[PDB]
Amino acid sequence: LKKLDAGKQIKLETTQVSGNFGTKNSSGQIVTEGNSWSDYISQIDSISASI
Amino acid sequence: EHASTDQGKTVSRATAVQDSNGESWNTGLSINKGESAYINANVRYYNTGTAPMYKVTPTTNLVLDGDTLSTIKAQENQIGNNLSPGDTYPKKGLSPLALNTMDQFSSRLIPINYDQLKKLDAGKQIKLETTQVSGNFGTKNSSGQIVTEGNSWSDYISQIDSISASIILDTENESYERRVTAKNLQDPEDKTPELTIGEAIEKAFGATKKDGLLYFNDIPIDESCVELIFDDNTANKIKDSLKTLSDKKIYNVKLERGMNILIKTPTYFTNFDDYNNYPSTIPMSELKPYKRYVFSGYSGYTKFSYEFETTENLSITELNSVKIPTDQEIMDAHKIYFADLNTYINGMYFAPTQTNKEALDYIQKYRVEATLQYSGFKDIGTKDKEMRNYLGDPNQPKTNYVNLRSYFTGGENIMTYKKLRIYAITPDDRELLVLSV
Amino acid sequence: EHASTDQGKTVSRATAVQDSNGESWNTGLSINKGESAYINANVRYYNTGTAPMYKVTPTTNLVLDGDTLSTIKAQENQIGNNLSPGDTYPKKGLSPLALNTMDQFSSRLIPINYDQLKKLDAGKQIKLETTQVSGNFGTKNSSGQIVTEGNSWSDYISQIDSISASI
């Protein structure tokens, strides 16, 4: 706190994010529960070039 | 707060012979400066869409000036089980529901700071913003039983918003919001039929045709009888597309994705043919007290749309309404100072003024070269500022404070009326001299 | 409140020779201006419709003047297992059930302010408004056993209200 009130600033860094994607079930209804992105993040990053 | 009061009595005797009696009264007050108050807000949901929403769980903000005090999701106490189109939870004729719990199990109350409370008691208002809303929709299972569990609207919100154009209608404080599918002309495989603005309007709001214009129920909602409001992109698209057509009407432009069309129905409107809603041929008593209006009409044929305000096809329509400091500024911001005497020197304030706030806030890490008692003029290190109250007065603001007692002295006292130098150090590692004795 | 009381007794001696002894009394009272009281309300549900509603879980408000003090959903302690048409929970001949818990696990009591308490002790009354009521209905599964879990009335309330005239 003594550092904070003397002018220093707190920086916020996002280490990771989580979230689901949408897909069709046996019916025509979109379901986005249990379809995580962390399963495909590494696989996509391992075979792709970032632009 | 914590208000406490006391009252006592005393009986004593001594020995000549002495006697004594007395009493006392006390009263106290304790305040926590981290959670000095709890805010309770009475909210009330409403629906202007097309479909009902079961288990309404909205998220709301609470902003004081620009500071978001908290964002609270609706717990079990503040969930609306049903919300029909045009309805309200709680229903009309019921008091608003309170939202005074912050955690997930409604076991904690929303706190506010001490400075936030001081702002609140001085007249400032807390606004509420609905960032998002969660809810379910109903569908039929294998049997004839409606199931509204596991079906969510957040799955389809983005998909609906991505391929639809939003249209709104005011009609005297009864808002209607609809989304209409728009065809993508850059995709040869998009087979959605093309619609003009007129067809989209007559489909979304269920308007009817009698002569060629559109009537909602009885009000005319044609482009020449109402006020059409677009954003920048929609206006640009309409302007570009108008010059290509032949009859040159707004209701003939092809619908496109992302368009934002708002339709406002005038309160008073006459066409000299079948409508005259004016109360004269106006001594107030119908116009709202403090609100800005617009008077418009047609006179080729064009519209002028002059504007006026209240103090207490002619129609009258409503409307809705780094700076890095320089060296000289830094040197001048430290011109007024006070010496915290004992009589040896203990510190040095830097007085606040209406102009030196930014320059004082910019500077940290004062460097001091003072004259000690037994030793002589020497550097005594570089320490940070302290940000204490001015002159020790609790009313005065907080200013830069150079705590000379904590500098690298040998425990000796700093002499008065001797050589003293204070060098302010900017974040760019460029130092300037702000004090000299 | 927190009422406190003390009572002392002092014996002394000094040296001529001085002897002195006495006593003292004290009493205090501390109040919190944020939660200065707890309100307990005795409520009683009733049914005037046509079908029974199992697991009655109503939501109620508590208004003083225009201020909604709290809105509390029925916890496990205040859930009616059965409510037949024309019946009442608790049944006729039983005392009303208390509603004095605000959180989800019945671990917190309903607080009121200091100005609200000052209003309350001056004669003003707290009104109760039932905003909504939850509950289940019963049907038959693949067997002959009635199951009333997962079936809700909130799915059909709006659909029934949208195509019907109330009498």
Next chain:
Amino acid sequence: RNYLGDPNQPKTNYVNLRSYFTGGENIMTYKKLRIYAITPDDRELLVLSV
């Protein structure tokens, strides 16, 4: 603040002169003092003059 320092009296507008941008000096009595009330419309009026 509470009126006249009495806990019974209601809460009224209070102009805390000690916290204004003074140089720590005392505000003299029976001298020229002007207090301007500022409306939210940024229109000011003179409510006290001495």
